[PDB]
Amino acid sequence: ETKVIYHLDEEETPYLVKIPVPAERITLGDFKSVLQRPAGAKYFFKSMDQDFGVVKEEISDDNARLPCFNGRVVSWLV
Amino acid sequence: ETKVIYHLDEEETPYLVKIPVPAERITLGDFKSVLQRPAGAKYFFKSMDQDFGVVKEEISDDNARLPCFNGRVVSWLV
Amino acid sequence: ETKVIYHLDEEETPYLVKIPVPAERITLGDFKSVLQRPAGAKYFFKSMDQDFGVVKEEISDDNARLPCFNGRVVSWLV
Amino acid sequence: ETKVIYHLDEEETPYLVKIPVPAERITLGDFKSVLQRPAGAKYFFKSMDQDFGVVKEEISDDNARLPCFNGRVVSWLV
Amino acid sequence: ETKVIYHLDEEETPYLVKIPVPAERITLGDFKSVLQRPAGAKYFFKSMDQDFGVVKEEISDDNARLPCFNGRVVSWLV
Amino acid sequence: ETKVIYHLDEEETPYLVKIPVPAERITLGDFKSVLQRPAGAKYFFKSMDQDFGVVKEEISDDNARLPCFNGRVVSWLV
Amino acid sequence: ETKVIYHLDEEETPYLVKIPVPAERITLGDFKSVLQRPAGAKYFFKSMDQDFGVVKEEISDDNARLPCFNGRVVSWLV
Amino acid sequence: ETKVIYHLDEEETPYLVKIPVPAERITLGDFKSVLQRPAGAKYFFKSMDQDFGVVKEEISDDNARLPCFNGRVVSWLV
Amino acid sequence: ETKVIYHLDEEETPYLVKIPVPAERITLGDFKSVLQRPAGAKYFFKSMDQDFGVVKEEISDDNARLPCFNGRVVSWLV
Amino acid sequence: ETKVIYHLDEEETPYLVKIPVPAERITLGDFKSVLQRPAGAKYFFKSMDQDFGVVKEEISDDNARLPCFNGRVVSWLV
Amino acid sequence: ETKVIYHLDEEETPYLVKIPVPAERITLGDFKSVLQRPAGAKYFFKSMDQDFGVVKEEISDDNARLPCFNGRVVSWLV
Amino acid sequence: ETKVIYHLDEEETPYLVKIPVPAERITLGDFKSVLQRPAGAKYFFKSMDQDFGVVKEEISDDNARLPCFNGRVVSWLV
């Protein structure tokens, strides 16, 4: 069970979704299906870059795994 | 007796439902039955996260316990 | 005499009913009888919550008193 | 002479009947006589409330005066 | 002492300021002196009109009085 | 002094503006100079048509007079 | 000991200050003496109004007490 | 595969986009298409100048290559 | 060994200091002894408030313990 | 092609703009158009003075040529 | 051979020092012996933290190794 | 012939010394044989780093070459 916490563009408080798969094969398409967003949103994900530190990488490929930032998938929308 | 408070997407004022069960076994399906919403709504629930603080976690499993935030179930819809 | 003002779902102008009982024993069933609504409506009532402010609490128990919001029972339907 | 305008439930155009009494002692039962409605209708009357503005108060007592909203009794039925 | 409550444009929770004058002769310039708005703001005030009910009237003259809507000056900004 | 009541697109409560000219020569551009709208708005004014009853007519000429409705300029925006 | 949580203008995460006096006699100037703000700031405080619910009331008198909203002095700056 | 780390004007954390082309033919229009920016933004790019050192050169031509600063396209927006 | 990461006023990248005491009994005065700040600075520390989430609480007593936010003392200066 | 390097007031890293005109007719107005600055800024330019060495001369005339300091237009803003 | 680039307090251009030992066992006291600073300075070294990204960590033990951030020991003084 | 422009600690006017060897094999000890500095001074030389831009690298080996920054050996003392 992964608690994928995400945000949106203007709302100040973050959200959370319980995702039924563990944190070794969780992809973008599993997180995208349980949100029911109307159009194509920008799915940023908080990852650790070896050159710049914390980065919010946009993922648009549904086969790409989610970056488990300290075992807690922090995401963003729009 | 639990006084669950829920909002909606666009309306500015919160709601309230008196729920006859106490605050140790209240689930989503008890709250979902007394609302009589037409379609599948996004049932967010204000919960305290150990990493980010106040989060609004979406609950879809009807067996899940509601996260009573300081003894006051704050909720959100749509 | 209590002037319980109520609204409906889509109509922008509010209604009003003169109710012959005073504001210490007025319940849901006294207000529900003089309206002659065809089916089960959502009887919201504007109340003052000490944690979130103004709330529109749904009352479905006919023994429950109506929340006298500053001596003026503001209500909602559907 | 009072030109009481009244509406009905579904039809969009308003009617207009004449009541021979002036606008200080016109009652509900005087207005109820010239309408020849078959059953008990909901006689709403457009009145000015000091807390919410324009309200449509249902009058069911035949001794109650009609609210002269700017000298023009706007009414509603059903 | 007047509890003149004012809103802003996008902020949903309202403010409150105290004025040292009573409610009988409170002007806009007394309310304009405890705010210090950075630009020329639109000072709407909740008033009761005899033809339309609750209106939010714009007051621009600093010597003009404020409408005590039920003994509570409700205002709006921008 | 004219009380030009104007509504907006989605807001339910109407506004009010005191205008320093009388009702005999009040124009749209005089009413437009006191609102300072951010873009070109649709200024629908409540008028009385002799074939269809009450109408909300668009006025775009800034020197065009405003149709009073029983001595009260009712307007609409957007 | 009181936990007087306060926000700032643009900063989204809130602050916290322990104040050595209890909640029964805590004043603004006691809270003002522990921040040492570089200019005259606007000290809004979350209070409960009996007509509008939660309000952020501005307090400027240094001897005026602070509204203990549910035993927690929430505040705002600028 | 190139990981184009970029920033914006006010946000403190950098972003990242995975770009499916390698680092010998990547242009500005390839990076501009996957961002879906609303208007014409200032596309600065971190480059090594032999006279002044690290510079952030604005690129507006879509045929121009991106400066591979140590094999990592660091960029800026607005 | 504690890694007390701390920020400054305008500098966006954070610092880090090692403290020879463990995290269970670390005080402000031990953290204040490895900095040698030129004046009295504001020592905000990231803590978890049970009513508002993450807060930056100011600690001024040198014998007061530091809030181990997820086993990591995050701090701020001035 | 001229690669004009410019700085700003507080940012430590220099910028760069490619300019499609050569270094014999480049003026201030050609450089000012491609920057899209909001207000009137101080456009300093590095030039070699015969009495004081390197100087940053302010140019405000759009007909004035840019001083090609060793074939490299070094500039400054604000 | 290591290129230990370091900065100072007010000087914006960075320095560089060739150190005769490799990057596997380079310590602070080896780097401290080649500068001969006139007083005890703060040796902030750019390191990669797994919870916040890039950090400027302070090293005070002369036998403590230096964090080779991407094979380049970036440092700071005072 | 080389024009090795160099500075001192507090003097803002740079010096210039001629060295009878060309730029291809100019060493520090050849530059050290022209100045005759009264003590062991720090010989920083303006070089181009491929990760940080312009740097002032300290050279202490007398047989080590000097970095020809754009064909002009800019140096520093103490």
Residue numbers in the entry:
A (entry chain C), B (entry chain D), C (entry chain E), D (entry chain F), E (entry chain K), F (entry chain L), ...: 13 to 90
How did the manuscript describe this experimental structure?
A current model for signal transduction is that ligand-bound Fzd recruits the cytosolic protein Dishevelled (Dvl), which then binds to Axin and thereby recruits the destruction complex to the activated receptor complex. The Dvl-Axin interaction is essential for Wnt/β-catenin signal transduction and is mediated by a DIX (Dvl and Axin interacting) domain present in each protein. Dvl has an N-terminal DIX domain, as well as a PDZ and a DEP domain; the DEP domain mediates the interaction with Fzd. We found that purified Dvl DIX in solution forms antiparallel, double-stranded filaments whose stability depends on the inter-strand interactions in the double helix.
We obtained a cryo-electron microscopy (cryo-EM) map of the DIX filaments with a global resolution of 3.6 Å, which enabled a near atomic resolution structure. Remarkably, unlike the single stranded fibers observed in crystals of Dvl2 DIX domains, in solution the Dvl2 DIX filament forms an antiparallel double helix. Successive protomers in the filament are related by a rotation of 48.0 ± 0.2° around the helical axis, with a rise of 13.5 ± 0.3 Å per protomer. The pitch of the helix is 101.3 Å, larger than the pitch of the single stranded helix observed in crystals of Dvl2 Y27D (85 Å) and Y27W/C80S (88 Å). The head-to-tail interface within each strand is similar to that observed in crystal structures. For example, Y27 packs against F56 and K68 of a neighboring protomer. We next tested the role of the inter-strand contacts that form the antiparallel double helix. These contacts are formed between two opposing protomers, principally by the β3-β4 (residues 60–66) and β4-β5 (residues 82–84) loops. Some residues on the β3-β4 loop (e.g., D63) participate in intra- and inter-strand interactions, whereas others appear to be involved solely in inter-strand contacts, including M60, G65 and N82. The structural, biochemical and signaling data indicate that the double stranded DIX filament is stabilized by inter-strand, antiparallel contacts that are functionally important.
